[PDB]
Protein backbone atom coordinates (compact mmCIF):
# COMPACT_ATOMS: atom_id res chain seq x y z
CA UNK A 1 0.00 0.00 0.00
CA UNK A 2 2.29 2.87 1.27
CA UNK A 3 4.93 4.27 -1.14
CA UNK A 4 7.77 6.62 -0.06
CA UNK A 5 9.91 8.26 -2.82
CA UNK A 6 13.51 9.01 -1.71
CA UNK A 7 14.44 12.70 -2.16
CA UNK A 8 17.05 14.34 -4.42
CA UNK A 9 20.56 15.59 -3.44
CA UNK A 10 19.18 19.09 -2.48
CA UNK A 11 20.00 19.25 1.26
CA UNK A 12 23.81 18.79 1.61
CA UNK A 13 25.46 19.35 5.04
CA UNK A 14 28.96 19.75 3.66
CA UNK A 15 31.21 18.04 6.27
CA UNK A 16 28.98 15.54 8.17
CA UNK A 17 28.20 11.85 7.66
CA UNK A 18 25.66 10.60 5.08
CA UNK A 19 23.44 7.55 5.87
CA UNK A 20 24.13 5.14 2.90
CA UNK A 21 25.73 7.44 0.25
CA UNK A 22 23.41 6.62 -2.74
CA UNK A 23 25.21 9.31 -4.85
CA UNK A 24 23.48 8.81 -8.19
CA UNK A 25 26.10 9.74 -10.88
CA UNK A 26 29.03 7.39 -9.97
CA UNK A 27 26.49 4.76 -8.78
CA UNK A 28 24.52 4.75 -12.10
CA UNK A 29 27.78 4.75 -14.13
CA UNK A 30 28.81 1.66 -12.05
CA UNK A 31 25.33 0.11 -12.78
CA UNK A 32 25.75 0.79 -16.55
CA UNK A 33 29.33 -0.67 -16.53
CA UNK A 34 27.90 -3.81 -14.79
CA UNK A 35 24.92 -4.14 -17.20
CA UNK A 36 27.09 -3.94 -20.40
CA UNK A 37 29.24 -6.93 -19.18
CA UNK A 38 26.34 -9.07 -17.73
CA UNK A 39 23.86 -8.53 -20.66
CA UNK A 40 26.75 -8.04 -23.18
CA UNK A 41 25.18 -9.48 -26.40
CA UNK A 42 22.14 -7.08 -26.49
CA UNK A 43 24.39 -4.02 -27.16
CA UNK A 44 25.10 -5.48 -30.67
CA UNK A 45 21.36 -5.30 -31.60
CA UNK A 46 21.01 -1.74 -30.19
CA UNK A 47 24.13 -0.34 -31.97
CA UNK A 48 23.34 -2.06 -35.32
CA UNK A 49 19.67 -0.88 -35.55
CA UNK A 50 20.86 2.71 -34.78
CA UNK A 51 23.83 2.41 -37.23
CA UNK A 52 21.49 1.10 -39.99
CA UNK A 53 18.50 3.49 -39.46
CA UNK A 54 20.08 6.91 -38.58
CA UNK A 55 21.69 8.82 -41.49
CA UNK A 56 24.76 10.40 -39.72
CA UNK A 57 27.49 9.60 -37.11
CA UNK A 58 26.29 12.74 -35.21
CA UNK A 59 22.68 11.47 -34.78
CA UNK A 60 23.94 7.88 -34.08
CA UNK A 61 26.24 9.11 -31.24
CA UNK A 62 23.51 11.45 -29.89
CA UNK A 63 21.07 8.52 -29.29
CA UNK A 64 23.66 5.84 -28.25
CA UNK A 65 24.83 7.74 -25.10
CA UNK A 66 21.16 8.26 -24.04
CA UNK A 67 20.14 4.64 -24.88
CA UNK A 68 23.10 3.18 -22.89
CA UNK A 69 22.31 5.58 -19.98
CA UNK A 70 18.66 4.29 -20.05
CA UNK A 71 19.48 0.54 -20.49
CA UNK A 72 19.59 -0.60 -16.75
CA UNK A 73 16.28 1.28 -15.90
CA UNK A 74 14.36 -1.74 -17.37
CA UNK A 75 14.49 -5.60 -17.38
Amino acid sequence: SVLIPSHAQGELTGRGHKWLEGDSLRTHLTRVEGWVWKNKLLALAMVTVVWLTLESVVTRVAVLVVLLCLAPVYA
Binding site: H17, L20, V49, T53, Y74, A75
Partner: protein, 496 residues
Protein backbone atom coordinates in the same frame (compact mmCIF):
# COMPACT_ATOMS: atom_id res chain seq x y z
CA UNK B 1 -26.61 -28.71 -8.00
CA UNK B 2 -23.21 -27.23 -6.94
CA UNK B 3 -22.70 -25.51 -10.32
CA UNK B 4 -25.46 -22.97 -9.31
CA UNK B 5 -23.40 -21.75 -6.28
CA UNK B 6 -20.46 -20.48 -8.41
CA UNK B 7 -19.77 -17.44 -10.65
CA UNK B 8 -17.92 -19.62 -13.25
CA UNK B 9 -19.82 -22.47 -14.98
CA UNK B 10 -19.31 -24.17 -18.38
CA UNK B 11 -21.92 -26.36 -20.17
CA UNK B 12 -20.96 -29.42 -22.29
CA UNK B 13 -23.29 -31.37 -24.65
CA UNK B 14 -23.42 -34.55 -26.81
CA UNK B 15 -25.48 -37.12 -28.84
CA UNK B 16 -26.28 -40.73 -27.63
CA UNK B 17 -23.20 -42.05 -29.56
CA UNK B 18 -20.61 -39.68 -27.91
CA UNK B 19 -19.89 -41.93 -24.80
CA UNK B 20 -16.75 -39.93 -23.65
CA UNK B 21 -16.05 -36.21 -22.92
CA UNK B 22 -12.67 -34.42 -22.55
CA UNK B 23 -12.59 -31.58 -19.98
CA UNK B 24 -10.06 -29.20 -18.44
CA UNK B 25 -11.05 -28.73 -14.79
CA UNK B 26 -9.87 -25.62 -12.90
CA UNK B 27 -9.76 -24.47 -9.27
CA UNK B 28 -12.80 -22.17 -8.79
CA UNK B 29 -14.32 -23.43 -12.12
CA UNK B 30 -17.23 -25.88 -12.59
CA UNK B 31 -18.69 -28.02 -15.46
CA UNK B 32 -22.20 -29.44 -16.09
CA UNK B 33 -22.47 -32.36 -18.60
CA UNK B 34 -25.73 -32.68 -20.62
CA UNK B 35 -25.37 -35.65 -23.00
CA UNK B 36 -28.59 -36.88 -24.74
CA UNK B 37 -30.69 -39.20 -22.52
CA UNK B 38 -28.06 -39.50 -19.67
CA UNK B 39 -28.54 -38.18 -16.07
CA UNK B 40 -26.67 -34.84 -15.88
CA UNK B 41 -23.59 -34.42 -13.67
CA UNK B 42 -21.61 -31.56 -12.11
CA UNK B 43 -17.79 -32.06 -12.08
CA UNK B 44 -15.09 -29.88 -10.44
CA UNK B 45 -11.51 -29.90 -9.06
CA UNK B 46 -11.73 -29.31 -5.28
CA UNK B 47 -8.04 -29.39 -4.19
CA UNK B 48 -4.42 -29.72 -5.44
CA UNK B 49 -2.09 -30.55 -2.50
CA UNK B 50 0.85 -32.43 -0.93
CA UNK B 51 1.48 -33.30 2.73
CA UNK B 52 4.84 -31.90 3.99
CA UNK B 53 6.64 -30.66 0.79
CA UNK B 54 10.47 -30.41 1.01
CA UNK B 55 12.13 -27.09 2.06
CA UNK B 56 14.32 -25.21 -0.39
CA UNK B 57 16.08 -22.02 0.99
CA UNK B 58 15.32 -20.13 4.17
CA UNK B 59 15.84 -16.32 4.01
CA UNK B 60 16.21 -13.82 6.89
CA UNK B 61 14.02 -10.65 6.91
CA UNK B 62 15.34 -9.04 10.16
CA UNK B 63 19.02 -9.21 11.10
CA UNK B 64 19.85 -9.33 14.84
CA UNK B 65 23.36 -8.01 15.54
CA UNK B 66 25.40 -8.33 18.77
CA UNK B 67 28.88 -8.21 20.40
CA UNK B 68 30.63 -5.82 17.96
CA UNK B 69 34.46 -5.53 18.25
CA UNK B 70 37.00 -3.28 16.45
CA UNK B 71 40.83 -3.18 16.05
CA UNK B 72 43.19 -0.61 14.41
CA UNK B 73 46.89 0.04 13.44
CA UNK B 74 49.11 3.13 12.93
CA UNK B 75 50.35 4.16 9.43
CA UNK B 76 53.13 1.78 8.18
CA UNK B 77 52.34 -0.76 11.02
CA UNK B 78 50.66 -3.23 8.57
CA UNK B 79 47.03 -4.49 8.46
CA UNK B 80 44.75 -4.72 11.51
CA UNK B 81 43.76 -8.36 12.31
CA UNK B 82 41.15 -9.87 14.70
CA UNK B 83 39.92 -13.38 15.79
CA UNK B 84 36.24 -12.91 14.72
CA UNK B 85 37.31 -12.66 11.01
CA UNK B 86 37.67 -16.51 11.06
CA UNK B 87 34.37 -17.75 12.57
CA UNK B 88 30.85 -18.72 11.45
CA UNK B 89 28.04 -16.24 12.25
CA UNK B 90 30.22 -13.05 12.01
CA UNK B 91 30.32 -10.28 9.36
CA UNK B 92 33.34 -8.00 8.90
CA UNK B 93 34.80 -5.10 6.87
CA UNK B 94 38.27 -3.50 6.78
CA UNK B 95 39.09 0.10 5.83
CA UNK B 96 41.84 2.77 6.00
CA UNK B 97 41.19 5.40 8.75
CA UNK B 98 43.08 8.75 8.91
CA UNK B 99 45.77 8.93 11.69
CA UNK B 100 48.35 11.38 13.18
CA UNK B 101 49.74 12.99 16.40
CA UNK B 102 46.15 13.73 17.58
CA UNK B 103 45.25 10.00 17.89
CA UNK B 104 48.60 8.62 19.15
CA UNK B 105 50.44 7.81 15.88
CA UNK B 106 54.04 8.73 14.95
CA UNK B 107 53.29 9.50 11.26
CA UNK B 108 50.44 11.35 9.49
CA UNK B 109 48.66 9.12 6.94
CA UNK B 110 46.19 6.30 6.25
CA UNK B 111 46.19 3.54 8.94
CA UNK B 112 44.20 0.26 9.01
CA UNK B 113 40.96 -0.71 10.88
CA UNK B 114 38.76 -3.87 10.95
CA UNK B 115 35.24 -4.06 12.45
CA UNK B 116 33.36 -7.27 13.35
CA UNK B 117 29.80 -8.11 14.52
CA UNK B 118 27.78 -11.33 15.11
CA UNK B 119 24.69 -11.93 12.90
CA UNK B 120 21.44 -13.94 13.39
CA UNK B 121 17.68 -13.91 12.47
CA UNK B 122 15.00 -12.60 14.87
CA UNK B 123 12.72 -15.27 16.30
CA UNK B 124 9.88 -15.40 13.65
CA UNK B 125 11.40 -13.23 10.86
CA UNK B 126 12.24 -15.95 8.24
CA UNK B 127 10.84 -16.67 4.80
CA UNK B 128 10.82 -20.43 3.94
CA UNK B 129 10.37 -21.75 0.39
CA UNK B 130 8.73 -25.17 -0.21
CA UNK B 131 8.72 -27.27 -3.45
CA UNK B 132 6.37 -30.09 -4.58
CA UNK B 133 7.30 -33.70 -5.55
CA UNK B 134 5.35 -34.96 -8.60
CA UNK B 135 5.27 -38.51 -7.07
CA UNK B 136 3.28 -37.30 -3.97
CA UNK B 137 0.75 -34.63 -5.20
CA UNK B 138 -2.95 -35.42 -4.66
CA UNK B 139 -5.59 -33.97 -7.01
CA UNK B 140 -9.21 -34.28 -5.69
CA UNK B 141 -12.06 -34.37 -8.23
CA UNK B 142 -15.71 -34.40 -7.05
CA UNK B 143 -18.89 -35.48 -8.89
CA UNK B 144 -22.55 -34.63 -8.09
CA UNK B 145 -25.75 -35.92 -9.82
CA UNK B 146 -28.70 -33.61 -10.66
CA UNK B 147 -30.98 -35.46 -8.19
CA UNK B 148 -33.77 -32.80 -8.41
CA UNK B 149 -33.32 -31.67 -4.76
CA UNK B 150 -31.65 -28.41 -3.59
CA UNK B 151 -28.87 -28.40 -0.97
CA UNK B 152 -27.36 -24.96 -0.30
CA UNK B 153 -23.71 -23.92 -0.13
CA UNK B 154 -22.47 -24.42 3.48
CA UNK B 155 -24.53 -27.62 4.03
CA UNK B 156 -23.83 -31.27 2.99
CA UNK B 157 -25.31 -33.23 0.03
CA UNK B 158 -25.55 -37.06 0.34
CA UNK B 159 -25.00 -37.71 -3.42
CA UNK B 160 -21.40 -36.31 -3.69
CA UNK B 161 -18.53 -38.77 -4.45
CA UNK B 162 -14.74 -38.17 -4.16
CA UNK B 163 -11.90 -39.43 -6.38
CA UNK B 164 -8.29 -38.84 -5.23
CA UNK B 165 -5.68 -38.90 -8.03
CA UNK B 166 -1.90 -39.44 -7.62
CA UNK B 167 0.76 -40.53 -10.19
CA UNK B 168 -0.14 -44.23 -9.55
CA UNK B 169 -3.72 -44.24 -10.99
CA UNK B 170 -5.60 -45.15 -14.20
CA UNK B 171 -9.39 -44.88 -14.78
CA UNK B 172 -11.44 -44.94 -11.54
CA UNK B 173 -15.16 -45.83 -11.29
CA UNK B 174 -17.54 -44.03 -8.88
CA UNK B 175 -20.96 -45.57 -8.09
CA UNK B 176 -23.30 -42.50 -8.22
CA UNK B 177 -26.04 -44.41 -6.30
CA UNK B 178 -29.12 -45.44 -8.36
CA UNK B 179 -27.80 -43.29 -11.29
CA UNK B 180 -25.18 -46.01 -12.07
CA UNK B 181 -21.39 -45.58 -12.51
CA UNK B 182 -19.13 -42.78 -13.90
CA UNK B 183 -15.60 -43.58 -15.19
CA UNK B 184 -12.91 -40.90 -14.81
CA UNK B 185 -9.19 -40.59 -15.82
CA UNK B 186 -6.77 -37.78 -14.78
CA UNK B 187 -3.45 -36.86 -16.48
CA UNK B 188 -1.42 -35.90 -13.35
CA UNK B 189 1.55 -34.67 -15.44
CA UNK B 190 1.42 -31.38 -17.49
CA UNK B 191 -0.72 -28.19 -17.19
CA UNK B 192 0.69 -26.90 -13.88
CA UNK B 193 4.53 -26.98 -14.24
CA UNK B 194 5.55 -28.17 -10.75
CA UNK B 195 9.26 -27.43 -11.44
CA UNK B 196 8.55 -23.62 -11.64
CA UNK B 197 6.45 -23.07 -8.43
CA UNK B 198 7.59 -22.39 -4.83
CA UNK B 199 5.05 -22.22 -1.97
CA UNK B 200 6.43 -19.36 0.21
CA UNK B 201 5.76 -19.36 4.00
CA UNK B 202 6.43 -16.33 6.31
CA UNK B 203 4.56 -16.93 9.63
CA UNK B 204 1.31 -18.97 9.99
CA UNK B 205 0.52 -17.39 13.42
CA UNK B 206 0.09 -13.79 12.06
CA UNK B 207 -3.66 -13.00 12.09
CA UNK B 208 -3.88 -10.61 9.06
CA UNK B 209 -1.92 -12.19 6.15
CA UNK B 210 -2.45 -15.21 3.83
CA UNK B 211 -0.58 -18.29 5.13
CA UNK B 212 1.43 -18.72 1.88
CA UNK B 213 2.13 -17.36 -1.66
CA UNK B 214 2.64 -19.14 -5.04
CA UNK B 215 5.97 -17.51 -6.12
CA UNK B 216 7.93 -18.22 -9.33
CA UNK B 217 11.22 -20.20 -8.91
CA UNK B 218 13.47 -17.97 -11.09
CA UNK B 219 12.43 -14.97 -8.94
CA UNK B 220 12.91 -16.78 -5.57
CA UNK B 221 16.53 -17.78 -6.40
CA UNK B 222 17.44 -14.07 -7.02
CA UNK B 223 16.26 -12.58 -3.66
CA UNK B 224 19.15 -10.35 -2.46
CA UNK B 225 18.88 -11.36 1.26
CA UNK B 226 20.83 -13.57 3.78
CA UNK B 227 20.10 -17.30 3.23
CA UNK B 228 20.61 -20.94 4.34
CA UNK B 229 19.15 -24.48 3.94
CA UNK B 230 17.47 -26.35 6.86
CA UNK B 231 19.45 -27.54 9.93
CA UNK B 232 22.50 -25.28 9.32
CA UNK B 233 23.26 -22.69 12.08
CA UNK B 234 25.21 -20.06 10.04
CA UNK B 235 23.71 -17.61 7.49
CA UNK B 236 25.26 -17.01 4.05
CA UNK B 237 25.48 -13.42 2.67
CA UNK B 238 24.82 -11.69 6.07
CA UNK B 239 26.53 -8.55 4.61
CA UNK B 240 23.22 -7.81 2.76
CA UNK B 241 21.62 -6.40 6.00
CA UNK B 242 24.64 -4.79 7.78
CA UNK B 243 26.10 -1.57 6.39
CA UNK B 244 29.07 0.17 8.02
CA UNK B 245 29.69 3.84 8.88
CA UNK B 246 32.68 5.82 7.58
CA UNK B 247 35.70 5.13 9.86
CA UNK B 248 36.97 7.29 12.72
CA UNK B 249 40.54 6.95 14.11
CA UNK B 250 39.92 3.92 16.43
CA UNK B 251 36.11 3.26 16.04
CA UNK B 252 33.69 2.39 13.17
CA UNK B 253 29.87 2.14 13.43
CA UNK B 254 27.73 -0.91 12.48
CA UNK B 255 24.24 -0.04 11.15
CA UNK B 256 21.32 -2.50 10.72
CA UNK B 257 19.02 -2.06 7.65
CA UNK B 258 16.01 -3.28 9.73
CA UNK B 259 12.96 -5.51 9.15
CA UNK B 260 12.45 -6.14 5.38
CA UNK B 261 8.92 -7.74 5.78
CA UNK B 262 7.09 -4.77 4.23
CA UNK B 263 9.38 -4.60 1.15
CA UNK B 264 8.76 -8.32 0.43
CA UNK B 265 4.95 -8.00 0.82
CA UNK B 266 5.07 -5.09 -1.70
CA UNK B 267 7.26 -7.08 -4.17
CA UNK B 268 4.71 -9.99 -4.08
CA UNK B 269 1.83 -7.76 -5.36
CA UNK B 270 0.26 -9.77 -8.26
CA UNK B 271 1.22 -13.32 -7.02
CA UNK B 272 -1.64 -15.83 -6.26
CA UNK B 273 -2.39 -16.98 -2.68
CA UNK B 274 -1.82 -20.51 -1.28
CA UNK B 275 -3.15 -22.19 1.90
CA UNK B 276 -1.57 -24.28 4.72
CA UNK B 277 -3.72 -26.58 6.88
CA UNK B 278 -1.94 -28.75 9.49
CA UNK B 279 0.32 -30.96 7.29
CA UNK B 280 -1.37 -29.97 3.93
CA UNK B 281 -0.04 -27.36 1.44
CA UNK B 282 -2.79 -26.41 -1.07
CA UNK B 283 -2.52 -24.48 -4.30
CA UNK B 284 -5.49 -22.12 -5.04
CA UNK B 285 -4.77 -21.86 -8.76
CA UNK B 286 -4.19 -24.65 -11.33
CA UNK B 287 -5.82 -27.12 -13.73
CA UNK B 288 -6.01 -30.83 -14.73
CA UNK B 289 -7.14 -32.56 -17.96
CA UNK B 290 -9.71 -35.35 -17.54
CA UNK B 291 -11.55 -37.82 -19.76
CA UNK B 292 -15.00 -38.72 -18.35
CA UNK B 293 -17.09 -41.68 -19.61
CA UNK B 294 -20.89 -41.71 -19.37
CA UNK B 295 -21.67 -45.24 -20.69
CA UNK B 296 -22.59 -46.94 -17.36
CA UNK B 297 -24.95 -44.14 -16.13
CA UNK B 298 -28.65 -45.08 -15.57
CA UNK B 299 -31.75 -42.88 -15.94
CA UNK B 300 -33.73 -42.99 -12.65
CA UNK B 301 -37.54 -43.18 -12.52
CA UNK B 302 -38.48 -43.87 -16.19
CA UNK B 303 -41.03 -46.54 -15.04
CA UNK B 304 -43.09 -44.21 -12.76
CA UNK B 305 -46.59 -42.72 -13.39
CA UNK B 306 -47.50 -39.02 -13.94
CA UNK B 307 -48.46 -36.66 -11.09
CA UNK B 308 -52.03 -35.37 -10.65
CA UNK B 309 -51.84 -32.13 -12.72
CA UNK B 310 -54.03 -30.26 -10.16
CA UNK B 311 -52.05 -30.89 -6.90
CA UNK B 312 -48.91 -28.67 -7.33
CA UNK B 313 -47.99 -25.38 -5.54
CA UNK B 314 -44.81 -23.23 -5.88
CA UNK B 315 -42.07 -23.17 -3.16
CA UNK B 316 -39.55 -21.02 -5.13
CA UNK B 317 -41.13 -19.06 -8.01
CA UNK B 318 -39.27 -18.95 -11.39
CA UNK B 319 -36.09 -16.85 -10.90
CA UNK B 320 -33.09 -16.01 -13.11
CA UNK B 321 -29.96 -18.10 -12.31
CA UNK B 322 -27.57 -15.56 -13.90
CA UNK B 323 -26.26 -18.43 -16.14
CA UNK B 324 -28.96 -17.97 -18.87
CA UNK B 325 -31.26 -20.54 -17.11
CA UNK B 326 -34.53 -20.40 -15.14
CA UNK B 327 -34.63 -21.98 -11.65
CA UNK B 328 -37.79 -23.07 -9.77
CA UNK B 329 -39.09 -25.35 -6.99
CA UNK B 330 -42.52 -27.07 -6.54
CA UNK B 331 -44.41 -28.84 -3.70
CA UNK B 332 -46.87 -31.70 -4.35
CA UNK B 333 -49.66 -33.49 -2.39
CA UNK B 334 -50.46 -36.63 -4.52
CA UNK B 335 -49.25 -40.29 -4.44
CA UNK B 336 -45.41 -40.77 -4.51
CA UNK B 337 -43.01 -41.50 -6.19
CA UNK B 338 -44.09 -39.93 -9.54
CA UNK B 339 -43.00 -37.82 -12.61
CA UNK B 340 -43.51 -34.01 -12.85
CA UNK B 341 -45.37 -32.92 -16.09
CA UNK B 342 -43.17 -29.84 -16.83
CA UNK B 343 -43.17 -27.90 -20.17
CA UNK B 344 -42.73 -24.34 -21.52
CA UNK B 345 -44.20 -22.51 -24.53
CA UNK B 346 -44.05 -19.32 -26.64
CA UNK B 347 -47.11 -17.26 -27.75
CA UNK B 348 -46.60 -18.19 -31.46
CA UNK B 349 -47.85 -21.82 -30.92
CA UNK B 350 -49.45 -23.53 -27.85
CA UNK B 351 -48.43 -27.09 -28.95
CA UNK B 352 -44.58 -26.79 -29.29
CA UNK B 353 -42.66 -27.40 -26.04
CA UNK B 354 -39.52 -25.12 -26.02
CA UNK B 355 -38.06 -26.13 -22.61
CA UNK B 356 -34.44 -27.35 -22.93
CA UNK B 357 -34.32 -28.99 -19.47
CA UNK B 358 -31.03 -29.37 -17.54
CA UNK B 359 -32.69 -31.67 -14.93
CA UNK B 360 -33.68 -34.80 -16.99
CA UNK B 361 -36.97 -36.64 -16.19
CA UNK B 362 -37.70 -34.67 -12.93
CA UNK B 363 -39.48 -36.61 -10.12
CA UNK B 364 -40.95 -36.38 -6.64
CA UNK B 365 -39.47 -38.95 -4.19
CA UNK B 366 -41.03 -40.14 -0.88
CA UNK B 367 -38.64 -37.74 1.00
CA UNK B 368 -37.26 -35.28 -1.65
CA UNK B 369 -37.31 -33.93 -5.24
CA UNK B 370 -39.22 -30.95 -6.75
CA UNK B 371 -36.44 -28.68 -8.18
CA UNK B 372 -36.11 -27.95 -11.95
CA UNK B 373 -33.56 -25.95 -14.01
CA UNK B 374 -34.24 -25.16 -17.71
CA UNK B 375 -33.17 -22.94 -20.63
CA UNK B 376 -35.82 -20.98 -22.61
CA UNK B 377 -35.43 -19.05 -25.92
CA UNK B 378 -35.44 -15.19 -26.08
CA UNK B 379 -38.78 -13.33 -25.76
CA UNK B 380 -42.09 -13.91 -23.93
CA UNK B 381 -43.04 -17.34 -22.53
CA UNK B 382 -45.28 -19.40 -20.22
CA UNK B 383 -43.96 -22.21 -17.94
CA UNK B 384 -46.38 -25.04 -17.02
CA UNK B 385 -46.22 -27.64 -14.23
CA UNK B 386 -49.62 -29.34 -14.58
CA UNK B 387 -52.19 -26.61 -13.70
CA UNK B 388 -49.50 -24.21 -12.32
CA UNK B 389 -48.79 -21.51 -14.94
CA UNK B 390 -46.23 -18.66 -14.76
CA UNK B 391 -45.30 -16.00 -17.33
CA UNK B 392 -41.64 -15.31 -18.17
CA UNK B 393 -39.60 -12.83 -20.22
CA UNK B 394 -36.17 -14.16 -21.18
CA UNK B 395 -33.48 -11.44 -21.49
CA UNK B 396 -30.82 -11.30 -24.25
CA UNK B 397 -30.82 -12.55 -27.87
CA UNK B 398 -29.36 -15.23 -30.20
CA UNK B 399 -26.48 -12.84 -31.18
CA UNK B 400 -25.97 -11.97 -27.46
CA UNK B 401 -25.61 -15.73 -26.64
CA UNK B 402 -23.00 -16.20 -29.43
CA UNK B 403 -21.04 -13.25 -27.95
CA UNK B 404 -21.03 -14.47 -24.28
CA UNK B 405 -20.00 -18.04 -25.32
CA UNK B 406 -17.19 -16.55 -27.48
CA UNK B 407 -16.07 -14.14 -24.68
CA UNK B 408 -15.82 -16.99 -22.10
CA UNK B 409 -13.63 -18.91 -24.61
CA UNK B 410 -11.10 -16.03 -24.77
CA UNK B 411 -10.93 -16.11 -20.92
CA UNK B 412 -9.94 -19.83 -21.07
CA UNK B 413 -7.34 -19.06 -23.79
CA UNK B 414 -5.67 -16.21 -21.80
CA UNK B 415 -5.81 -17.92 -18.34
CA UNK B 416 -4.95 -21.52 -19.45
CA UNK B 417 -2.82 -21.26 -22.66
CA UNK B 418 -2.56 -24.22 -25.10
CA UNK B 419 -4.74 -26.52 -22.92
CA UNK B 420 -7.74 -24.38 -24.05
CA UNK B 421 -8.00 -26.59 -27.20
CA UNK B 422 -8.67 -29.82 -25.17
CA UNK B 423 -12.07 -28.67 -23.75
CA UNK B 424 -14.91 -30.48 -25.66
CA UNK B 425 -17.09 -33.60 -26.23
CA UNK B 426 -16.33 -33.96 -30.00
CA UNK B 427 -13.52 -33.19 -32.52
CA UNK B 428 -13.28 -30.81 -35.53
CA UNK B 429 -10.49 -29.97 -38.02
CA UNK B 430 -9.81 -26.31 -37.00
CA UNK B 431 -8.87 -27.44 -33.43
CA UNK B 432 -5.76 -29.15 -34.94
CA UNK B 433 -4.72 -25.86 -36.65
CA UNK B 434 -5.51 -23.69 -33.57
CA UNK B 435 -3.23 -25.77 -31.27
CA UNK B 436 -0.40 -25.73 -33.83
CA UNK B 437 -0.64 -21.92 -34.33
CA UNK B 438 -0.90 -21.25 -30.56
CA UNK B 439 2.07 -23.48 -29.58
CA UNK B 440 4.25 -22.10 -32.44
CA UNK B 441 3.45 -18.35 -32.22
CA UNK B 442 3.04 -18.25 -28.40
CA UNK B 443 6.23 -20.36 -28.10
CA UNK B 444 8.14 -17.79 -30.23
CA UNK B 445 6.85 -14.81 -28.14
CA UNK B 446 7.66 -16.59 -24.83
CA UNK B 447 11.16 -17.57 -26.20
CA UNK B 448 12.14 -14.12 -27.52
CA UNK B 449 10.45 -11.66 -25.05
CA UNK B 450 8.95 -13.81 -22.22
CA UNK B 451 10.28 -12.24 -18.97
CA UNK B 452 10.56 -8.60 -20.26
CA UNK B 453 8.54 -5.93 -18.33
CA UNK B 454 5.12 -4.72 -19.58
CA UNK B 455 6.01 -1.09 -20.46
CA UNK B 456 9.35 -2.17 -22.14
CA UNK B 457 7.32 -4.73 -24.23
CA UNK B 458 4.92 -1.92 -25.32
CA UNK B 459 7.89 0.42 -26.07
CA UNK B 460 9.56 -2.36 -28.17
CA UNK B 461 6.26 -3.08 -30.01
CA UNK B 462 5.72 0.67 -30.71
CA UNK B 463 9.40 0.95 -31.81
CA UNK B 464 8.86 -2.05 -34.18
CA UNK B 465 5.79 -0.26 -35.67
CA UNK B 466 7.88 2.98 -35.98
CA UNK B 467 10.64 1.00 -37.82
CA UNK B 468 7.86 -0.49 -40.04
CA UNK B 469 6.73 3.06 -41.02
CA UNK B 470 10.26 4.60 -41.34
CA UNK B 471 12.49 1.89 -42.98
CA UNK B 472 12.53 2.14 -46.83
CA UNK B 473 12.34 -1.60 -47.77
CA UNK B 474 8.61 -2.55 -48.35
CA UNK B 475 8.99 -6.28 -47.40
CA UNK B 476 10.74 -5.44 -44.09
CA UNK B 477 8.24 -2.53 -43.55
CA UNK B 478 5.15 -4.81 -43.75
CA UNK B 479 6.86 -7.57 -41.66
CA UNK B 480 7.63 -5.05 -38.86
CA UNK B 481 4.00 -3.73 -38.93
CA UNK B 482 2.55 -7.30 -38.75
CA UNK B 483 5.00 -8.57 -36.05
CA UNK B 484 4.72 -5.36 -33.94
CA UNK B 485 0.90 -5.80 -33.92
CA UNK B 486 1.24 -9.47 -32.78
CA UNK B 487 3.74 -8.47 -29.99
CA UNK B 488 1.41 -5.65 -28.81
CA UNK B 489 -1.75 -7.88 -28.85
CA UNK B 490 -0.14 -10.65 -26.71
CA UNK B 491 1.40 -7.99 -24.36
CA UNK B 492 -1.92 -6.14 -23.82
CA UNK B 493 -3.56 -9.59 -23.26
CA UNK B 494 -1.54 -10.05 -19.96
CA UNK B 495 -1.35 -6.44 -18.56
CA UNK B 496 0.16 -4.84 -15.37
Amino acid sequence: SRCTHLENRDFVTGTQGTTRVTLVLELGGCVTITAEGKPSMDVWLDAIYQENPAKTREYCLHAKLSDTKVAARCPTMGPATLTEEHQGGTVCKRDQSDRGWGNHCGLFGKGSIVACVKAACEAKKKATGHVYDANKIVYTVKVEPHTGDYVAANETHSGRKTASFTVSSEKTILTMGEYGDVSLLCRVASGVDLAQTVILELDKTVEHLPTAWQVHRDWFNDLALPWKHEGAQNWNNAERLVEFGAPHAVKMDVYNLGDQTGVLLKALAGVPVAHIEGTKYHLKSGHVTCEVGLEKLKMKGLTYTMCDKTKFTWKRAPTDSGHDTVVMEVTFSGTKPCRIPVRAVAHGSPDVNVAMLITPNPTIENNGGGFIEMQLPPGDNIIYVGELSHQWFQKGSSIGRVFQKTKKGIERLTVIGEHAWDFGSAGGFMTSIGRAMHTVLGGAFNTLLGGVGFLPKILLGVAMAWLGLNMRNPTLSMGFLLSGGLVLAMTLGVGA
